[PDB]
């Protein structure tokens, strides 16, 4: 059909291969099949809640793969249960909406792509036929729809999820009689569930039950029903509603209390978990009640019924189990196991993790990793990147499920995996660097801002962990920063920290104060800043009382990097004195032997800085200033073999190429007291200011390279030492030309003094104490990394050189689970558990006002 | 806390030997048909608690549970109850 | 006991010195007491 497939049938069809015509020639078999009743009412009061009640339907429908019966007609609810069906193959979240209608009270016919009028709905009773409804079959229509739901119920399946018995359940809504005579059949012929609602006629007339008191009920919702059908058909209508109340085990209500989500998934999986117990041929089946109960997201309904202890599992038949409650993401549910038992470390054999990144790896997330391990490559991705593909080509194995879950951005099946790790801090900081390599992946901004939001989580787990670790023991805490892993990724809790950017984890006191000890080194704290300078110039004053070291005090003073870097400036200020010596009343024609000192004095400042071209990367290349010390230190031997020539005019240049030298080594002092005093939170401002004076002088430089040709173009190989030079020198005819050439100063000024104002202003614009303390901590770390050794003896070692803390984590995290739990009562304050504890009170009060009229009369 | 012909013995031995008190929980089956309790109506919260019991041991043993929750009754001041509504801490204590 | 004290007892066992064993060659003695009883439930 073209406004879609048609069947014309009579109501004596034939024997159940009409299921084998859709199932056949036709589409896809069914895990579910939901009914839909409402009758050929033109009128329907179409509220927002009865559009969330039927657009979950049709969500559920498609996450099951269900169909749908109802009827194919286009009005109201039909018509509007067909438009869900086209949003959701738009919105592509298939679902079948079977229609079946009479085929005698159709508008129009073609017999035979057929085409259908949908021309205008008016005052003639006959039907219109729906537009949207994937397949129709066409009161005449109810025993052909009737028959099929009860073939389909006995249909069974070989995949048998509930009991095979293909699930089949009826939502019904508002009034007529064929709606009541629809579930009559729908209970008495075989047993199928019903869900009806909390608005409509016969809906509310069934709601309310949950005699002539039905009669009584029965004209408060439909009145003017009652005033045409006749007193021989009245009382069918109370015969109807006796036969519905016989079997109240296959009755679900949707009331109007619930006003929220789960509401349709909670009454479809009532109702078919009812008509599983109720069956009582499955009482004793604990294992089809549980799958049942876990395709569903019942929770609430496995703890209280299948975890009882009246019911005896032994937790080791709960693999299979498991298995779907991870594949399917039941968050809830792989708790549930772990808290009635399951020791999740032998549940996660090898092959059960290569089927989870083989078959249960989503594609679009495997895609992903080529654009992060290409693009933006780690340490940690190459070692994830090749745990993926170990197991996708076929030892902590909750570390991979964890890994698994968190590459999905599984935001809370991974955090129930999470709490049975060992090492819980430094999964957390393991997760929000890998979470951090994802999220820059720009192929997809919702992938990406979801795994930068769970890396943010991540963190903050870690920051709540470790200051829960830090609070019960210092020194433990500081073990467990440490800690080697055993190949997590390789890495400390203190390295993925770091790589990551975690400046939460960073900024917390713990890990502030553990940098403090290990720049003061085994010097502690609170001695003062003098008395260890004084300790300096003064060997017998660490012998004595005067420091406090928490001989081997000697070896434990001069190996903090308090005191190696102190002596290093000023071992560096002692050099510049003796360079400024040489280079003033030395310096005759030979390598004075004062000289000879300052030649191997930049040698160990030499071979200090090709050591720090190891732990390099071509890091060091990129730090604006580092690169300056090669360059003094090049430009010194360049001096070296200028001042061994023997001419006066190359000597002579060799005494300049040190002169010039010695400013760049008096440069890097004033860039070490400028960096040493602003560590605080200045070292933002600075180091950002200091790469915009950077290209503002990089821009002052290009316009004087251009007011260089202005000035050698007016005047008269020569020229790149005259168009570079001289207009440094220079700040060391009229035709009419001052008309532009004011405006030429007039542009460049502001174009060179807003680059200056940039320059002092930019820092401001683009948290500002984590944003400092992860600088303070990574400026201070690559010190303490940098060789801790006085200068001149650290040749003397380049050349010589040529799980109980787990346990211990683990009873932390346990009190730091409890944390989140107990306080979250501010959302147990609400009146959602308080609200009917009280009612329950009054119905106690209700349940002893049974008592009364029991016997007045 | 929690259920078993074994827990509802040992709670009679301590109530009726010598006289130390008992503290009982709000979840499990032997463990809420002394909550509720605070005749046959013993017998019928004590299907509500544990139903699948019942079905197996005897009614010669049925009549014995009756009897045995009839002797911790006669001391209820050895019979601190740890209510679920108490969600929060000092409950233990 | 490796896997911690062990002691092999039938249920006809001495006079009080149980606890004197409790008291004299082993650990401190008591300012509470807690029992608990939940059986021998593979199940919790
Ligand atoms: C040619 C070479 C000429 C050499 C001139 C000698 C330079 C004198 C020494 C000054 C070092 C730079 C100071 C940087 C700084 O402020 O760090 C200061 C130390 O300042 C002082 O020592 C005060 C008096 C110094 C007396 C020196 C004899 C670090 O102090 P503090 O840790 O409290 O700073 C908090 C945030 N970082
Ligand atoms: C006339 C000359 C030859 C003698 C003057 C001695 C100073 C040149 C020396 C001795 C004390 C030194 C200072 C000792 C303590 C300060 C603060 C200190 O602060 C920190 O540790 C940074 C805080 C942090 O890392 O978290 C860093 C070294 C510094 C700048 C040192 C810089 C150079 C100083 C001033
Ligand atoms: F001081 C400083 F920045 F506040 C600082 C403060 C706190 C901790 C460490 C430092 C720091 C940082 C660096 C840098 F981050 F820049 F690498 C340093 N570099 C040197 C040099 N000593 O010899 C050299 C100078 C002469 C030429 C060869 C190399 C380099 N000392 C440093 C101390
Ligand atoms: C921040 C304390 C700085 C004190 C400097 C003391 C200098 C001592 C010089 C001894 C010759
Ligand atoms: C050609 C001179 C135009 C006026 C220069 C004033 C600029 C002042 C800059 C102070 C930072
Ligand atoms: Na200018
Ligand atoms: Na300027």
Redesign the pocket.
């Known amino acids: 059909i073209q406004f879609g497939k048609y069947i014309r049938l009579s109501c004596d069809t034939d024997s159940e291969t009409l299921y084998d015509l859709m199932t056949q020639h036709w589409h896809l078999k069914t895990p579910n099949l939901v009914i839909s009743v409402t009758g050929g009412a033109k009128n329907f009061a179409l509220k927002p809640r009865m559009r969330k009640i039927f657009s979950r339907l049709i969500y559920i429908a498609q996450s099951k793969g269900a169909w749908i019966f109802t009827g194919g007609t286009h009005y109201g609810l039909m018509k509007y249960i067909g438009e869900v069906v086209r949003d959701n193959t738009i919105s592509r979240s298939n679902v079948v909406a079977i229609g079946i209608a009479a085929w005698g009270m159709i508008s129009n016919r073609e017999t035979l792509l057929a085409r259908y009028i949908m021309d205008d709905l008016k005052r003639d009773p006959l039907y219109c036929l729906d537009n949207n409804h994937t397949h129709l079959l066409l009161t005449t229509e109810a025993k052909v729809r009737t028959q099929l739901e009860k073939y389909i119920s006995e249909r069974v399946i070989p995949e048998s999820n509930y009991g095979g018995k293909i699930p089949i359940v009826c939502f019904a809504q508002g009034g007529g009689k064929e709606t009541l005579k629809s579930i009559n059949v729908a209970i008495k012929s075989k047993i199928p569930c019903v869900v009806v609602e909390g608005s409509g006629r016969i809906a509310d007339v069934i709601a309310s039950l949950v005699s002539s008191c039905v009669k009584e009920s029965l004209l408060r919702f439909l009145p003017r029903t009652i005033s045409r059908l006749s007193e021989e058909e009245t009382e069918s209508w109370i015969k109807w509603i006796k036969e519905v109340l016989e079997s109240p085990h296959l009755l679900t209500v949707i009331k109007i209390e619930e006003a929220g989500d789960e509401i349709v998934s909670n009454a479809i999986s009532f109702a078919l978990y009812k008509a599983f117990s109720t069956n009582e041929h499955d009482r004793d089946n604990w294992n089809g009640q549980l799958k049942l109960l876990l395709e569903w997201n019942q929770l609430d309904l496995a703890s209280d019924e299948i975890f009882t202890n009246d019911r005896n599992w032994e937790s080791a038949d709960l693999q299979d189990v498991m298995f779907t409650a991870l594949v399917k993401d039941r968050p809830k549910f792989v708790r549930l196991f772990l808290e009635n038992g399951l020791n999740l470390r032998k549940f996660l054999t090898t092959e059960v993790l290569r089927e989870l990144y083989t078959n249960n790896f989503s594609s679009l997330v495997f895609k992903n990793l080529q654009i992060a391990k290409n693009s933006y490559n780690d340490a940690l991705l190459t070692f994830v990147w090749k745990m993926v593909e170990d197991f996708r080509r076929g030892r902590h194995p909750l570390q991979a499920l964890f890994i698994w879950s968190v590459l999905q951005n599984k935001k809370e099946l991974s955090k129930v995996i999470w709490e049975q790790t060992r090492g819980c801090t430094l999964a957390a900081l393991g997760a929000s660097k890998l979470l951090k390599s994802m999220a820059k992946v720009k192929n997809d901004i919702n992938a990406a801002g979801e795994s930068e939001e769970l890396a943010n989580e991540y963190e903050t787990r870690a920051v709540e962990l470790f200051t829960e670790c830090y609070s019960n023991d210092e020194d433990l805490a500081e073990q467990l920063l440490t800690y080697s892993c055993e190949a997590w990724g390789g890495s400390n809790c203190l390295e993925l920290a770091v790589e990551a950017r975690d400046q939460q984890f960073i900024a917390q006191p713990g890990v502030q104060n553990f940098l403090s000890k290990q720049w003061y080194g085994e010097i502690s704290r609170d001695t003062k800043?003098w008395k260890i300078i004084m300790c300096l110039f003064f060997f017998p004053l660490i012998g004595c009382g005067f420091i406090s070291f928490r001989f081997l005090y000697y070896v434990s003073f001069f190996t903090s990097p308090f005191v190696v870097f102190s002596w290093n400036?000023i071992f560096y200020?002692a050099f510049?004195?003796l360079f400024?010596y040489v280079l003033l009343m030395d310096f005759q024609k030979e390598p004075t032997a004062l000289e000879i000192i300052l030649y191997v004095l930049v040698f160990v400042l030499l071979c200090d800085e090709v050591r720090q071209w190891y732990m390099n990367g071509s890091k060091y290349f990129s730090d604006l200033w580092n690169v300056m010390d090669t360059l003094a230190i090049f430009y010194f031997i360049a001096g070296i073999v200028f001042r061994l020539h023997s001419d006066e005019s190359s000597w002579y240049s060799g005494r300049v190429i040190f002169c010039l030298d010695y400013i760049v080594f008096?440069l890097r002092?004033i860039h070490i007291?400028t960096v040493?005093?602003?560590?605080?939170p200045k070292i933002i401002m600075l180091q950002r200011m200091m790469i915009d004076v950077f290209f503002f002088l990089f821009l002052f430089a290009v316009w004087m390279v251009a007011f260089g040709v202005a000035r050698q173009g007016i005047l008269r190989e020569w020229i790149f030492r005259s168009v570079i030079y001289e207009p440094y020198l220079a700040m060391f005819f009229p035709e009419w030309i001052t008309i532009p050439l004011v405006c030429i100063y007039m542009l460049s000024t502001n174009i060179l003094l807003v680059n200056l104002l940039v320059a002092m202003f930019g820092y401001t614009v683009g948290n500002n104490d984590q944003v400092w303390k992860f600088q303070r901590f990574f400026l201070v770390q690559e010190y303490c990394s940098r060789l801790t050794i006085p200068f001149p003896f650290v040749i003397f070692a380049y050349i010589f050189m040529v799980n109980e803390i787990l346990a211990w984590e683990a009873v932390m995290k346990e009190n730091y689970l409890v944390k989140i739990n107990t306080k979250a009562n501010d959302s147990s304050e609400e009146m959602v558990h308080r609200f009917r504890q009280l009612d329950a009170k009054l119905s106690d009060l209700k349940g002893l006002l049974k008592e009364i009229s029991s016997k007045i009369k």
């Open positions: 800043n400036v200020i510049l004195l400024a008096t002092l007291f040493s005093r602003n560590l605080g």
